[PDB]
Amino acid sequence: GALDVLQMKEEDVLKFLAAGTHLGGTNLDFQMEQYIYKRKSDGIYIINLKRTWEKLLLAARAIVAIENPADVSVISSRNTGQRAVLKFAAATGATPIAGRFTPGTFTNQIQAAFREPRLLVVTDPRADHQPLTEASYVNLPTIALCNTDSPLRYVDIAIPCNNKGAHSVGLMWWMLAREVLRMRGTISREHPWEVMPDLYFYRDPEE
Amino acid sequence: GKAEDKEWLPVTKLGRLVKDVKIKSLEEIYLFSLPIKESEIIDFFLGAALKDEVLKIMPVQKQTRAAQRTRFKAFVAIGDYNGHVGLGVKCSKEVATAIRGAIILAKLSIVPVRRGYWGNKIGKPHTVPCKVTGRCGSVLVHLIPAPRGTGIVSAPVPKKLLLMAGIDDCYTSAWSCTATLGNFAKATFDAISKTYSYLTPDLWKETVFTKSPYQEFTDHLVKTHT
Amino acid sequence: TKKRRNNGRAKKGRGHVQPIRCTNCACCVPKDKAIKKFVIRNIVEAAAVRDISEVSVFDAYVLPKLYVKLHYCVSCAIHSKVVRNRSREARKDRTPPPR
Amino acid sequence: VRMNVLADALKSINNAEKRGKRQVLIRPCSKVIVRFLTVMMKHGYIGEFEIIDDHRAGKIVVNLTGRLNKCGVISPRFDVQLKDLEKWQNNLLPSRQFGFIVLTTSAGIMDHEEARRKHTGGKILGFFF
Amino acid sequence: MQNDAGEFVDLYVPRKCSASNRIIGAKDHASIQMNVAEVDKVTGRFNGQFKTYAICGAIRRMGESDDSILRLAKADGIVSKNF
Amino acid sequence: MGRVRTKTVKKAARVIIEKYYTRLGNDFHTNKRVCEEIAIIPSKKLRNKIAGYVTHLMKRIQRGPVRGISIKLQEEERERRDNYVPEVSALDQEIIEVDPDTKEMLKLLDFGSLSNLQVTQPTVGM
Amino acid sequence: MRAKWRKKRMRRLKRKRRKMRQRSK
RNA sequence: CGGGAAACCAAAGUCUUUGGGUUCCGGGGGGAGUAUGGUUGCAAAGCUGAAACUUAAAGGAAUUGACGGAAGGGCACCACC
């Protein structure tokens, strides 16, 4: 949005630059091309950082529009997102799934794990492909974190970022939790937040 | 025994709402294009007005080391003679279970049927709104508008589904292997089904949106429910 | 019904291709239908090398390689177990076996 | 070779409508194509359009609104008389309530409902619904 | 549908796709309705007001819904005609 | 020969360890007495086989996790790798270098001023 | 190769019938 | 994408919502590419080409079995060493 109260600050841009979020792959799909700045002299694509913040605020404006927070479902089958989705679901009251998704969880009405959500958020479209393709049987809207070579086939909001691993995946979930809590009125739009980004990251060498 | 209540308790969000609150018709379930998975929802809205028809019972079999092994397949059609019809199929080791299973699938498959006029717009509509068609296997089926009081010009299989749908007047045509009753029934139900999704000049004005039933009743599903 | 998209041959954009005679049976088949095998081996076996290195007159010598190129028809390649038949989806794999 | 230009123009629009595209480019342009497009636009089936001059017959860009089910051509330009026009609209149209045949007449290119008011026959060009 | 007395005779009037102007059928289970929060202009906070869109299942499975939702959000004020 | 244990043995041993981990140990003759008072087992010969696999599982649980079994003692130290680690008192700091085309991308976004810079190779690496 | 042999059988029968009739007149 | 009986095909698509131009050519299975006339050739033969009579199926794609003097794993003193 145009508003100064929604503008991206210097201190967020430095946190993007320090985590590698702007660095894509060596390949580009034709659906992702509008999110790209340029290709480097070494064959790597640069993701446009202002495009990310608009698509992330549009995603937060979808997540705030659900009146019961337990109706939102959150997923990661790769390890680099598992701590991050568990912390996101603690900060705001969504339902997490981590590890293997069981086929038929959304469509086998009798099943012990059966559930019926209103919104679905996924960490990587190529890896999390079962809950994406299974959402096509039940009228379920979708948000996803997309790299330059991600296949867009059932996602309705794609957020441009490096999703390969490490600090970049944890930072995106932390920043999405910050803005949903801000615009619902639970924390300040000006005072810094008490939760450090480093709480969401995956398994750097411990000692 | 005596037919008291609690023969049903819901297992879906839609079933929890239909049993309790002001979801007043199937048309506000069709408007949001939701899947129906509890058979008791359609007994709640249409009920004893629905009438039932066995089209064919068919034997099928597989070869084994010992003998040929046989199953019975039943085709069933259902409707209320005023704008609703459904078709269903099941295959079982015994005929009575095949018919009873086919009736449940024939209730879950029900769709709304569109009706219109051949001439000037006097009274209430009585024929298909425009020329339509459906396919299954090699079989092709086609329906054409007709002047008031002709009846249905068709073979037996398509005539029974058009009567249960509540259409008075219709001209019809077919092509390729109609002798396969299952593909002939599904090609007919495909033609009937397409009548409410053909864009026509009376549907050109802009759409106005509303909240869905899961959004209007978002607190009823939380405050006293599981 | 058609079994293979390439008809079991490499020919695309051509009329005629020259034949060759097989190394087992001398049957006659096209150069691009024939199954290829190029073999490189020592003249002396891995068991025998030690016995022939110690009787050598030289303080340093390296035993030579033998080079042979072989051609088979489909019947010889199947009977001599050079190729096996495969599952309907596995027939599409064009990558050679692992080492 | 290209034996007829109006058949290309309508086949090009018809393939673009089915893919859900919002614009289409027609080339070559002709006096017959501009008069046919105008009849669809006046009845509400397409948006407005723009012509490009290039010194070689020209090109047209057209805006699409999603309402069009089909448009098409009858290749031999058969003659029609007022007594036989009922047989053609019974063959080609989806209902008696909507859709139009397009004719060329000595009073101009026009809609088959206007040809009855003007009491005139002509040659068939195409249809839309 | 209306008759010569001017009264209406359809069972219901079906919805159309916001991106594409085609009717969404009673069994199109791949289709969706999207809902998005508005925020107040002084403090960037939810006031309970919202906007809605409906998308055809055929446009979703070819991968065009993300760009369609973006064009709709730029046509309304939400993305503010710059990017 | 064949000494493989059937699912009736393997499932009963897991359910015993989930409920009674604090009673159990490495001595087969003590495990054999515990399993007789916490459960109804129809045969002496089945009781001996269950206490045998329980004794095998205790010696595994002393080394690391077993995917089908859970205990408080192992969950609360997982909850200590969860939350925050002792590793560092501050983040990895934002003072990081920028490539000339990222400098140009930030210039168009009205930002920069805090990063060092250097150029890559003359032609694409092969 | 039965069809190729049925073709050869007909050709030799036709060669016999040719020589038999053209001798008569 | 869409099409098709399917195997499959970016054409083998834009078809009951059926019409861009134009050449050759099929009409249940056999008798039969046969008899007879013409025509070309040194010859072998090529081209053109019937009927009487006879018959309830002949054929295409795919599924589950059984079978192989097909391939790969494993087993048995009613098998062998």
Region at C2 (left for phi over 0; alpha for psi -120 to 50; beta for the rest): beta
Q: CATH code at C71?
A: 3.30.1740.20
Q: Chain B contacts of E4, Cβ < 8 Å?
A: 120-122
Q: Which of A65, F64, E14, A18 is nearest to B199 (CA)?
A: E14
Count chain A–chain F contacts defined by CB atoms under 8 A: 57
Architecture of F7-62 per CATH?
A: Orthogonal Bundle (1.10)
Burial class (CB in 10 A: 0-12, 13-18, 19+), D46: buried
> How close E35 comes to chain D (CA, Å)?
23
Q: Which of B86, E43, E63 is nearest to A6 (CA)?
A: E43
Total number of domains constituting chain E:
1
The number of angstroms, rounded, from the C-alpha of D129 to the middle of its chain's C-alpha atoms is 10
Strand H contact with C87 (CB < 7 A): no
Say if B197 is an interface residue toward chain E (CB within 8 Å).
yes
Q: Which of B20, B99, B96, B21 is nearest to B55 (CA)?
A: B99
Instruction: Give E 59-78 residues with CB within 8 A of chain A.
Output: 60-61, 63, 65-67, 69, 73, 78
Which residues contact residue A56 at a Cβ distance below 8 angstroms, ignoring those fewer than 6 apart? Answer: A159, A172, A175, A176, A179
By residue range, what is the domain housing residue C8? Answer: 1-98
Query: What residues does F35 pair with on adjacent strands?
Result: none
D85, D47: one domain? no
Cβ–Cβ under 8 Å, residues F89 and F70 = no
Strand H contact with G9 (CB < 7 A): no
The token pair at B154 is 């068709």
Tell me the backbone φ, ψ of residue A73, rounded to 5 degrees.
Answer: -115, 135
D50, D94: one domain? no
Question: Which residues of C line the annotated binding site?
Answer: 22, 25, 73, 76
Quickly list H helices, A42-201.
49-63, 82-91, 129-134, 167-183
**Torsional sign, CA E58, E64, E70, E71:** negative
Strand H contact with B19 (CB < 7 A): no
By residue range, what is the domain housing residue D101? Answer: 69-129
Lookup result for tokens 């049927």: B113
Helices and strands (H and E) in chain A: how many: 5, 7
By residue range, what is the domain housing residue E2? Answer: 1-82
Q: Measured between alpha carbons, how far is residue C55 from residues A167, B188, C59, C64 in Å?
A: 66, 92, 11, 16
Q: Which of B102, D24, B217 is nearest to A118 (CA)?
A: B217
Quickly list H helices, chain B.
13-18, 27-30, 40-45, 95-108, 156-165, 181-193, 213-216, 220-223
Q: Which of A161, A162, A121, A168 is nearest to A140 (CA)?
A: A121
- Which strand (E) or helix (H) includes residue E1? none
Which nucleotides of strand H come closer than 7 angstroms to any CB of the protein?
Answer: 1-2, 4-9, 13-21, 33-36, 44-45, 60-62, 64-66, 70-72
Instruction: Please report the DSSP string for F45-78 in residue order.
Output: HHHHHHHHHHHHHHHHHTTS--TT---HHHHHHH
The token pair at F62 is 């002393």
Strand H contact with G17 (CB < 7 A): yes
Cβ contact, residue pair B11, A109, below 8 Å: yes
- Nominal resolution (angstroms): 2.9
**Torsional sign, CA C71, C75, C80, C86:** positive
> In the structure, do chain A and chain G come into contact, i.e. share 3 or more CB pairs under 8 Å?
no
User: What are the respective helix, strand and coil percentages of chain A, to the nearest 5?
Assistant: 35, 15, 50
Total number of domains constituting chain D:
2
Cβ contact, residue pair B199, D69, below 8 Å: yes
Distance CA E32, CA A157 (A): 13
In Å, the largest CA–CA distance within chain D is 44
Strand H contact with D73 (CB < 7 A): yes
SS3 (DSSP) at D42: helix
Answer whether the bond into residue D76 is a cis peptide, omega within 30°: no
**Torsional sign, CA C13, C19, C20, C21:** positive
Distance CA A24, CA A146 (A): 10
Long-range contacts, A201-204 (Cβ 8 Å, 24+)? A201/A83, A201/A84, A201/A166, A201/A167, A201/A170, A202/A79, A202/A80, A202/A81, A202/A82, A202/A83, A202/A84, A202/A165, A202/A166, A202/A169, A202/A170, A203/A79, A204/A166, A204/F87
The amino acid at A130: Q
Nearest by CB to D95, from B130, B199, B204: name it.
Answer: B130
Distance CA E2, CA B202 (A): 9
Lookup result for tokens 């069981």: A102
Cβ–Cβ under 8 Å, residues F58 and F18 = no
Distance CA A106, CA A135 (A): 7
Cβ contact, residue pair D98, B200, below 8 Å: yes
Q: Would you kindly state where each structural domain of chain A is located, as residue ranges?
A: 12-207
Distance CA F103, CA E47 (A): 39
- Strand H contacts in B 142-161 (CB under 7 A): 142
Cβ contact, residue pair E82, A2, below 8 Å: yes
Distance CA A9, CA A59 (A): 19
Nearest by CB to A138, from B11, B35, B222: name it.
Answer: B35
> How close E25 comes to chain D (CA, Å)?
16
> How close A109 comes to chain B (CA, Å)?
7
Distance CA B115, CA B84 (A): 11
Cβ–Cβ under 8 Å, residues E47 and E20 = no
Say if A190 is an interface residue toward chain F (CB within 8 Å).
no
Q: Which residue is nearest to nucleotide H22 (CA to C1')?
A: D1
Q: Which of B112, B192, B203, B197 is nearest to B160 (CA)?
A: B192
Say if F85 is an interface residue toward chain A (CB within 8 Å).
yes
The token pair at G11 is 């050709």
Distance CA B10, CA A59 (A): 33
End-to-end CA distance of chain A: 44
